[model samples]
Target chain A: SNAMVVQPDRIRCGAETTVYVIVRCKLDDRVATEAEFSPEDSPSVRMEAKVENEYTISVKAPNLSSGNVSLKIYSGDLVVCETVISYYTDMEEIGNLLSNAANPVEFMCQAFK
Target chain B: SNAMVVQPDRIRCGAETTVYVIVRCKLDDRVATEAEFSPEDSPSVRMEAKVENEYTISVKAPNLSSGNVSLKIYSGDLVVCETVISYYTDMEEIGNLLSNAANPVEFMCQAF
Candidate 1:
């Protein structure tokens, strides 16, 4: 009676994006109609939803911040299905590697020596 | 914009029971109405939801099966929120102790 699938479950932090999710109901009765997104820690991110099928839900990414977010669908006041989307904001780690790779810094030796 | 609390997060397996959950919405708007319960492994368990507030949800327990169950609330075709419920059906563990306590049978002694 309850089965739903969400696509693009992972995202990078930066700009607003969209994700597609499928919500399945019993007897194909179309019990769900709306969806909402909420971040676990970051408040800068925001989300909204648009129903694409009687069993499908479409949601757009928040203004991409950094935090674990919940993407859920509802039937009036009832919550039928949901999933979690993770945002990667560890840019400094990646940035450091790229910076070092680009410049090839010598930490222990001097170029003049 | 997402806050929901479920009461009696833990339950025992055997019979059917009900759990009360509070669903909170922004601006006191009723964005959720119905709730569903699904087990992570066992399919014998079942769940249903009722709206007590635009911010409150009430759910009845399944037929008490041993497995992790998910209690979810919905607003239309969208899923607004959900929580997990755990079921304890390890009667053997408890039963063994009770059985031992009831009958003090010594395995090392031969009661001829």
Candidate 2:
């Protein structure tokens, strides 16, 4: 197995974007044919994916508010590559977003600060 | 200063993604007003940022094939939070990206 990469490894919550995986090893004919979230709890994907070449796989970045996502690419039932992505919250915006909604914890944290 | 995180710690070569930094401290009004690469070169950005309040700053991810990125966020030249991001690469990919890229001579010194 060679090194694999997940493009746009980090992203803002709720943003829609495409993702890519580049595999340096298996440049052979046993190419990748499918991709999926490896764990049951991974953020859900927004679109279908396919292997574009022996070196790359493309998919949609997961739409999530916050968390890390692990992906597995496969050629039939055989797993060929894997990678992870992270999404961060604009916590500051969230502060304001919640401030208007009257979140006691958020208010208390700022009220004293 | 507090716990700062660089979301998307790893990524593939040549992909565009927005990078966000979450700072869990300093939630006062000394709000971050600016951001930049801390070193002579921390890759490059596509400009326009969000020092959204006091806990988060957003920027375009560096457009590079490989290497690590270190960022220093600021509030009017006053540095606030800083963090590093490492672009993912296969070590073997290094072997391929850098020409012949020899592994260098082995070192084995022993007297047992």
Candidate 3:
């Protein structure tokens, strides 16, 4: 039996976007071959994992017409996990994307102040 | 006013050893000039921090005859924090070094 899950949470985007992933399996000890996730039809791949278990992947930034995105993670032909994570290219516009969103500009205020 | 502390803890060694350090200052969030810690009279520097706040630094491994080592951390001329950290070349000797020591061969047991 195989038990694994990939959770898509708050992640930002850039040319060299750092995507963090958590992979868990109930099998106690087994190796994953490859992992990758992409937003549908987008030029940039958001997250890709070549190694097994928990790790980070950097993807090329994609140009998009909409904020909607897709995330897919695979182990061979088996789809271990699949989901969508939201991203915002613009800070101000990001607020409308989430009412619960942190004041996007606030954390970055230190650099300017 | 500055209130800063650096914690020195368990670290191992080699020609290229990795050093972990924690630096804290209470100027109510003033920037750090530089951070560093070392052993006395040794060629290898254990931890050297050119950046400010919580971060990691790598030091050149030192050649020493004795297991005894001194750790130092300085901010400007002010010695913010200083202590001693030990390293062992032999895994068995490492056991004698720490009663709390993990089984050395056990952790590396994966490689085999």
Candidate 4:
């Protein structure tokens, strides 16, 4: 048996981004034959694994709303490891945009002039 | 008095990066007149703050080694708030680059 590793367990998405998902196993352990990944929600947003270096895989992230994603690595029929990836974005950006439109100056300018 | 906030207290610096520092004060409290920032270690890599909005400021980071930075927000001679910023980089990038060089194939190609 070997330990599974994932880089950048958390990400902030503003646009489409690509994340690297890698699995490492003991030299003697059976190499990961395949992997599966899916978003916990948003079935429309999907992730597919591309294997490289015998143990490394890459997952592509589309521009999707913030949510948790689950990944499972498999070797033959047995499940090797599982992990969750979290994606988040700043809500302050939305607040700042709305604040400008709701500013009193805009209201006063339209009301008085 | 109001709270002083430093966005992205932690930053990963593969190259130069900028960090936003904002100081929000109560309507009755005095605004931060000036700010001074310095790295905890390297004095040569200095930072001069540029005031943006009344409550917002920006700090520029030069290509510097990863370390902790101390920022002091001042009103006249008094220090209103103090905060620290941390800069780091992925050691795995360096490790991967070295691994390519240290691979046995490279040694075999150069040797026998």
Tens digits of per-residue lDDT, candidate 4, A74-113, equal: 5555565578777765443333333444567864564476
List model 3 lDDT by residue over B1-112, tens digit each.
1222122233344424434333334211244433343445656454444432232222343544446566554555555556666655433232343432334663575767
Predicted structure 4, TM vs. truth: 0.36
Q: Estimate candidate 2's alpha-carbon lDDT, on a 0 to 1 scale.
A: 0.56
Give the better candidate number (1 or 3) by DockQ.
Answer: 3
Q: What is the C-alpha lDDT of each candidate?
A: 0.54, 0.56, 0.40, 0.53
Residue B81 error, candidate 4, Å: 3.3
- lDDT tens digits, residues B77-102, model 4? 56655787776654423343445445
lDDT of 4 at B34: 48
Can you give the DockQ of every candidate in the order shown?
0.01, 0.04, 0.02, 0.02
Per-model RMSD to reference = 22.2, 22.2, 21.8, 19.5
Give a tens-digit lDDT track for model 3, residues A1-113. 12222222334443234333333332122444344445556554533354422322213324344465665555556554556656644342333333332575743453266
lDDT of 1 by residue, B38-81 (tens): 77765533345665434444566766566677766666556667
From the highest lDDT down, the ranking of the candidates is 2, 1, 4, 3
Q: Which one is best on DockQ?
A: 2
My TM-score estimates for the predictions, one after another, are: 0.35, 0.37, 0.31, 0.36
For candidate 1, the per-residue lDDT at A18 reads 59
* Ranking of predictions according to TM-score: 2, 4, 1, 3
TM-score of chain A of each: 0.59, 0.60, 0.47, 0.52
